[PDB]
C-alpha cells in the first residue's frame, strides 16, 4: 500500500486521513474539499458505483 507521505490531488499534499475520491479518467486521488465533493456525495458515489471525473479531466 502507499506510504503515508505520498502526494495526491491538485494541491500535491498527502492523504492525511482526509476524505478523498479517485478519478476514473486519470487515476489520481483528490481531496473532496479540493474538488467540490462532499463526504455525503462520496458515500453515494461509492455505493452506486458511478464514475468520478476530476476537474483536470473535465
Amino acid at each position: 500500500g502507499p506510504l503515508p507521505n505520498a502526494l495526491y490531488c491538485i494541491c500535491r499534499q498527502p492523504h492525511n486521513n482526509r476524505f478523498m475520491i479517485c478519478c476514473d479518467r486519470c487515476e489520481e486521488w483528490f481531496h473532496g474539499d479540493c474538488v467540490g465533493i462532499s463526504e455525503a456525495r462520496g458515500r453515494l458515489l461509492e455505493r452506486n458505483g458511478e464514475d468520478y471525473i476530476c476537474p483536470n479531466c473535465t
Binding site: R18, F19, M20, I21, C22, G42, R43, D51
Partner: peptide, 7 residues
Amino acid sequence: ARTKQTA
C-alpha cells in the same frame, strides 16, 4: 467511485 473516508 473509489473513496477513502476518514478513519
